[PDB]
């Protein structure tokens, strides 16, 4: 039921996802990772596009 | 498995016995169908759309 | 939480901070606890750093509390 | 010091059927740019309009067809029809009908009117018939709205359902297309530092300029009325 | 020959006009080059890379 | 080397260079302001350059 | 069209085959969104011929790069064309000029 | 619908001090945060009625620039300390106050004579230091109710900060209703001098524009 709900992406799963996303870093990494500042963790803010 | 032999005995609906390898639109693309072409082998007859 | 600067100076080591806050967040998430500092709608790993920030979770405080949880 | 004077419209200068220069004379010092730019943001942002939203054509399935005996695709017809300027009066959505036969350009004047639906530009060429035996039949669903809904978000899932022959058009419900405002010093007798504000709006035809100014000022004043008694 | 062609319009022959800010309405000082560049749309869309 | 790597790179330095580089005769020369609040109030109202 | 072109834009448009170029002169007997019929003049009609040649336009077909290839007939009814002249622009062409 | 738009469901006013606020408005229509906060900033900056000093004489010391021994701080800094004075005045449109003080102590803004209608919102604001038992100062300030910022070069004349807000600056953020995240979020931040409170400063300025929209609304 959760799978069919978020496949439908109903009006509540965005509220649950923005709850999930709050303090949960994402490792943003670009490909020629020459040093350790090629991987840094960022808190994600939900944008469209 | 067990817990399917109990669930499919409750509602009684059989195993479907066929699987559903069908063609669907991939994720994200919303478009308009503008052509469909059916190619058949000669041994196979046809169907209504072909 | 933005930076763990107060937390790393309140422990003194950056990696043992990660281990201690991970242990505390595990106790708070699945172990069954309550947040010592009030959580201002934070995730579990931010409450752990705000408990380390206020001196309320170190390794020996967590260990003597594990002793007390075994005591019953 | 004394108090603030209040403006009202001194001119509605219909230069053309679309181009208009409204004038707003008695303003305080530094209210000219405030009122002119705020009103430009409301006018260019959010005015109601009647852009077409669905177009249906008998014998045409999708937007990527060619109707027989017209020298245009369906996409050129839809993008012509998106720029159909039409003012509807009592209604909110009204399905116009376009039937045209013979060789000729097909204009906006060939649409069967209703009386409460007024095209302002009848020479807006919709399509180009190029055969004597060929003829079309449209169903141009005008719909009142404000802003810009692309068709990609108009279909949420569907209203209830949709047949295989209803083309959707990305409706730009916005009557205005160019707002210039100049603040020049006002020639009154008593004061000198008071300045007039000339907004040179450029609508599509489906809006009165004084009506658009009053609607923008109503929008601004009700947002300010939400702003005017704060809550602690 | 550009500035002469710009002077056939009633556009300023330096190329730069005085642009006003869209949001706050006060102008940018030190006037700004405007004009018509032919901008392309390349075959690197975000619909094919996300 | 321990220098900051988050150096402002090109548009930020044009803004910070443009606002902080003097002109000989600009509008509002030789005024005396009570502080930066008065300076932003003078600039944002268009009385001073 | 490019407002600031090099003048090469017409030559690349015509010489790439995506345009529909008139092989002979004449007047359009009929225009359609998918075909253009050119009634050839008596000058170049090759006296054992039937008189007109049909340019069958290429409608919304798929490219190699999964884009759309589509021809819009730029000429109108009764409009006299010459040989070589563009009647239908290909993908990314405005009036027989390269329009990218 | 096209008749409704959107309205600020929340307006939560942080009060960092009593002379400082940070007002937020979480839902708003798209792009409206700029067309509201810019209008409010322009009104609070350039047309907001209040009163402050406009000129002074210090009992014939001299005109521009100055020379006065026995004062610790410079003159053109006394003009600056008078410039930062915020006064509340009643329906008297212009009031001339006399500040006489002698001693070595630093003269504050409580050392003005009292006349009831003039109220000093910060009577400990230093105008001068004296530090000499011999010298003394006696000045005739001139408060007057005015409109915006009226400087001296557009006029021992001081620039006048008639407008009661010292700094107003807004930012605009994003917000969401249920899925629509193209909306705005005004996060207005302002500091008054003390002549009014900043919750009263917005609600007076937003009043002033609604009066300016008198003859077009319905």
């Amino acid at each position: 039921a959760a799978k069919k709900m978020v496949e439908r992406e109903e009006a509540v799963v965005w509220d649950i996802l923005d709850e999930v996303i709050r303090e949960h870093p994402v490792l943003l990494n670009r490909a020629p990772t020459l040093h350790r500042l090629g991987i840094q963790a960022f808190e994600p803010v939900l944008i469209e596009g | 498995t067990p817990e399917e032999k109990l669930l499919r005995a409750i509602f009684g609906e059989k195993a479907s016995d066929v699987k559903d390898s069908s063609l669907r639109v991939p994720n994200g693309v919303s478009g308009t169908v503008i052509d469909v072409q059916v190619f058949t082998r000669d041994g196979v007859e046809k169907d209504k759309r072909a | 939480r933005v930076t763990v600067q107060d937390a790393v100076e309140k422990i003194g080591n950056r990696f043992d901070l990660v281990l201690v806050a991970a242990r505390r967040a595990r106790q708070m998430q699945v172990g069954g606890k309550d947040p010592l500092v009030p959580e201002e709608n934070d995730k579990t790993t931010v409450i752990a750093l705000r408990e380390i920030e206020e001196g309320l979770i170190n390794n020996q405080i967590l260990d003597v509390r594990e002793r007390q949880e075994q005591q019953e | 010091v004394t108090e603030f004077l209040k403006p009202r419209l001194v001119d509605i200068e219909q230069v053309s059927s679309t181009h208009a220069k409204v004038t707003l004379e008695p303003l305080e010092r530094g209210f000219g740019h405030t009122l002119g730019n705020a009103l430009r943001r409301i006018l260019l942002s959010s005015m109601p309009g009647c852009a077409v939203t669905e177009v249906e054509i008998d014998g045409v399935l999708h937007e990527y067809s060619t109707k027989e005996g017209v020298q245009e695709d369906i996409l050129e017809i839809l993008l012509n029809l998106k720029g159909l300027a039409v003012r509807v009066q009592g209604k909110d959505e009204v399905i116009l009908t376009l039937n045209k036969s013979g060789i000729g350009p097909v204009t906006a004047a060939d649409i069967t009117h209703d009386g409460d639906v007024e095209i302002v530009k009848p020479q807006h060429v919709i399509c180009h018939l190029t055969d004597e035996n060929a003829s079309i039949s449209m169903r141009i669903k005008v719909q009142r709205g404000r802003g810009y809904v692309p068709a990609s978000t108009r279909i949420h899932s569907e209203e209830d359902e949709r047949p295989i022959g209803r083309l959707l058009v990305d409706a730009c419900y916005s009557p205005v297309e160019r707002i210039a405002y100049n603040v020049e010093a006002a020639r009154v007798e008593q004061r000198t530092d008071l300045d007039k504000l000339v907004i040179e709006m450029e609508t599509n035809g489906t809006i009165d300029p004084e009506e658009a100014i009053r609607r923008a000022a109503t929008i601004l004043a009700e947002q300010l009325e939400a702003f005017v008694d704060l809550r602690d | 020959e550009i500035k002469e062609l710009l002077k056939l319009g009633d556009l300023p022959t330096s190329g730069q006009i005085r642009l006003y800010d869209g949001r706050t309405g006060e102008q940018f000082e030190r006037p700004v080059t405007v004009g018509y560049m032919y901008m392309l749309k390349l075959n690197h869309l975000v619909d094919d890379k996300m | 080397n321990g220098e900051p790597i988050i150096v402002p790179s090109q548009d930020v330095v044009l803004g910070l260079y443009y606002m902080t580089r003097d002109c000989v005769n600009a509008k509002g020369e030789g005024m005396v302001l009570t502080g930066p609040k008065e300076a932003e109030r003078l600039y944002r109202s268009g009385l001073a350059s | 069209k490019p407002l600031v072109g090099t003048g090469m834009e017409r030559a690349v448009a015509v010489d790439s085959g995506v345009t529909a170029v008139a092989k002979r002169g004449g007047v359009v007997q009929y225009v359609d969104a998918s075909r253009i019929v050119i009634k050839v003049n008596e000058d170049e009609m090759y006296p054992g011929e039937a008189g007109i040649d049909i340019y069958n336009l290429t409608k919304y077909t798929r490219s190699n790069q999964n884009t759309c290839i589509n021809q819009m007939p730029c000429v109108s009814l009764g409009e006299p064309v010459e040989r070589g002249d563009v009647l239908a622009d290909g993908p990314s062409t405005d009036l027989g000029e390269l329009a990218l």
Side-chain angles (χ1 to χ4, degrees), chain A, chain B, chain C, chain D residues 1-158 162-186 188 191-224 226-231, chain E, chain F, chain G:
Chain A
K3 189 233 302 165
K4 280 152 55 184
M5 256 173 66
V6 317
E7 157 259 331
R8 285 190 202 281
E9 52 186 76
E10 280 169 5
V12 61
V13 312
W14 302 108
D15 317 349
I16 302 308
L17 159 73
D18 66 52
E19 166 173 337
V20 161
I21 211 70
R22 286 171 106 105
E23 291 103 358
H24 190 111
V26 275
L27 250 64
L28 252 71
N29 173 74
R30 207 193 54 120
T33 331
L34 285 348
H35 64 159
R36 52 169 259 197
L37 307 181
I39 321 181
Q40 299 154 15
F42 283 87
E43 284 202 314
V45 184
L46 298 195
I47 65 179
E48 291 120 308
Chain B
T1 92
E3 299 97 31
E4 191 79 32
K5 275 187 259 278
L6 176 50
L7 195 82
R8 285 213 165 279
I10 285 172
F11 305 101
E13 164 191 356
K14 277 80 46 187
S16 278
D17 112 271
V18 90
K19 70 155 52 87
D20 210 315
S21 145
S22 84
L23 166 70
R24 48 199 67 254
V25 196
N27 243 11
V29 39
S30 300
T32 322
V33 166
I34 72 170
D35 230 6
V36 171
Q37 347 184 51
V38 180
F39 299 102
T40 333
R41 208 167 47 89
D42 44 57
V44 179
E45 281 168 54
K46 256 123 179 184
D47 216 292
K48 283 153 299 204
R49 186 59 127 87
Chain C
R1 182 84 250 161
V2 193
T3 163
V4 293
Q5 202 221 342
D6 309 334
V8 304
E9 65 212 358
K10 245 305 206 178
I11 282 185
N13 211 65
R14 213 154 179 103
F15 311 137
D16 303 64
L17 167 89
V18 177
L19 290 201
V20 158
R23 177 149 78 118
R24 183 61 183 114
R26 178 127 306 122
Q27 292 186 346
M28 199 152 17
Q29 204 176 59
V30 271
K33 284 302 159 178
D34 51 39
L36 299 196
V37 62
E39 43 177 315
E40 273 305 275
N41 233 18
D42 292 309
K43 224 75 85 184
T44 300
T45 69
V46 176
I47 318 155
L49 306 159
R50 291 168 51 214
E51 285 178 7
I52 291 168
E53 254 190 353
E54 300 319 291
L56 307 181
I57 286 301
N58 280 58
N59 211 74
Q60 45 107 29
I61 310 151
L62 263 185
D63 282 359
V64 303
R65 283 218 185 88
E66 281 321 288
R67 298 305 303 121
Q68 297 322 288
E69 303 326 296
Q70 202 224 97
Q71 274 321 100
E72 332 276 334
Chain D
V1 51
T2 303
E3 252 184 25
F4 304 90
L5 276 198
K6 309 184 166 208
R8 45 220 45 82
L9 299 119
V10 197
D11 204 299
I12 297 136
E13 208 161 319
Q14 283 277 169
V15 181
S16 165
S17 190
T18 86
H19 197 132
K21 287 214 308 156
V22 315
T23 316
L24 273 73
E25 178 169 26
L27 297 163
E28 300 290 324
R29 175 133 303 260
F31 267 99
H33 285 296
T34 290
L35 267 207
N37 188 54
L39 278 188
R40 175 194 145 80
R41 303 270 325 261
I42 315 294
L43 282 165
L44 259 195
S45 180
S46 38
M47 285 291 125
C50 289
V52 316
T53 60
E54 303 199 32
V55 173
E56 188 162 3
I57 295 183
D58 285 71
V60 160
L61 280 315
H62 41 69
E63 305 145 299
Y64 307 93
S65 160
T66 100
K67 185 153 195 37
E68 181 43 73
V70 70
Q71 68 156 307
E72 289 128 319
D73 317 42
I74 295 301
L75 266 193
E76 192 177 347
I77 292 175
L78 287 203
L79 295 175
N80 287 319
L81 265 170
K82 187 189 52 156
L84 196 66
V86 41
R87 179 160 27 173
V88 322
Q89 227 51 55
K91 290 300 135 188
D92 282 57
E93 54 172 343
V94 37
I95 319 204
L96 304 175
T97 326
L98 213 230
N99 299 340
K100 174 59 167 297
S101 36
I103 290 182
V106 184
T107 88
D110 298 25
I111 315 180
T112 54
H113 271 143
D114 296 270
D116 66 325
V117 166
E118 169 215 1
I119 320 277
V120 276
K121 185 190 183 168
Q123 54 223 330
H124 175 58
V125 40
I126 294 186
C127 86
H128 257 92
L129 251 293
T130 163
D131 207 0
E132 291 278 1
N133 292 41
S135 182
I136 72 189
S137 300
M138 297 198 187
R139 243 165 311 279
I140 320 134
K141 204 239 277 185
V142 189
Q143 163 161 326
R144 148 162 281 104
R146 152 207 67 210
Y148 168 56
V149 282
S152 314
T153 89
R154 174 187 301 117
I155 39 150
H156 356 262
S157 316
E158 211 34 82
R162 187 149 39 87
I164 329 287
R166 246 165 50 188
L167 300 327
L168 299 116
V169 161
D170 309 69
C172 305
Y173 332 100
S174 197
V176 309
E177 283 133 13
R178 197 182 60 80
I179 314 282
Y181 69 102
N182 323 325
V183 200
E184 310 116 359
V188 305
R191 292 250 190 278
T192 158
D193 55 302
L194 298 209
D195 1 52
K196 66 156 55 55
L197 171 85
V198 193
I199 288 192
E200 328 179 11
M201 75 168 43
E202 190 109 3
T203 59
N204 60 350
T206 87
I207 244 292
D208 314 35
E210 193 203 15
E211 188 178 50
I213 289 292
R214 290 179 173 274
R215 222 172 285 226
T218 295
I219 290 159
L220 218 201
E222 280 312 309
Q223 302 290 320
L224 279 169
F227 227 129
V228 75
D229 257 5
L230 297 169
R231 146 195 144 194
Chain E
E1 296 174 308
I2 287 183
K3 319 208 161 204
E4 171 78 338
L5 185 39
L6 264 177
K7 261 173 308 213
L8 180 49
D10 286 285
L11 294 113
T13 156
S14 316
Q16 315 178 329
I17 53 171
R18 209 101 188 175
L19 282 186
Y20 307 91
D21 205 348
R23 306 108 77 85
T24 87
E26 54 223 352
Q27 70 171 25
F28 319 113
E29 340 97 336
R30 38 172 308 113
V32 176
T33 304
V34 313
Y36 275 69
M37 197 175 318
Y38 204 54
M39 302 296 294
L40 271 33
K41 173 179 162 98
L42 303 205
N43 210 12
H44 294 88
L45 307 326
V46 82
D47 299 74
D48 293 343
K49 295 190 173 321
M50 192 250 265
Chain F
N1 47 102
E3 315 275 322
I5 203 56
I6 44 143
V7 68
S9 33
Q10 28 173 90
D11 246 355
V12 191
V13 356
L14 194 56
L16 264 85
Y17 178 83
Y18 172 72
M19 65 197 288
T20 65
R21 74 138 286 208
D22 84 305
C23 209
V24 163
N25 178 29
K27 211 200 310 159
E29 185 137 5
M31 307 194 166
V32 274
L33 302 327
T34 202
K37 314 288 191 74
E38 187 126 6
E40 189 197 349
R41 170 165 78 257
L42 286 207
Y43 170 66
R44 283 287 181 80
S45 42
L47 274 155
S49 99
Chain G
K1 42 173 196 333
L3 249 53
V4 187
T6 51
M8 201 84 172
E9 282 99 23
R10 188 164 276 101
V12 161
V14 171
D15 296 329
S16 157
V18 289
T19 177
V21 150
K23 317 185 312 169
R24 280 169 313 194
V27 177
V28 203
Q29 202 229 335
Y30 173 64
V31 207
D32 203 5
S34 180
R35 58 146 57 102
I36 304 165
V37 173
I38 296 308
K39 168 60 201 166
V40 194
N41 313 297
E42 86 298 311
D43 195 302
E44 43 216 289
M45 221 153 48
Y46 266 89
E49 204 238 4
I52 96 274
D53 51 343
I54 294 183
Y55 298 114
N56 231 48
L57 266 35
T58 293
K59 288 327 274 164
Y60 286 86
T61 196
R62 169 195 161 276
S63 319
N64 261 11
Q65 325 299 128
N66 275 356
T67 68
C68 147
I69 284 155
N70 183 50
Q71 315 208 30
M72 290 262 208
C74 51
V75 309
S76 100
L77 254 187
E79 190 149 29
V81 307
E82 284 161 3
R83 66 141 55 239
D85 275 12
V86 183
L87 313 117
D89 318 352
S92 215
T93 35
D94 174 274
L95 239 140
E97 221 168 9
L98 199 80
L100 257 38

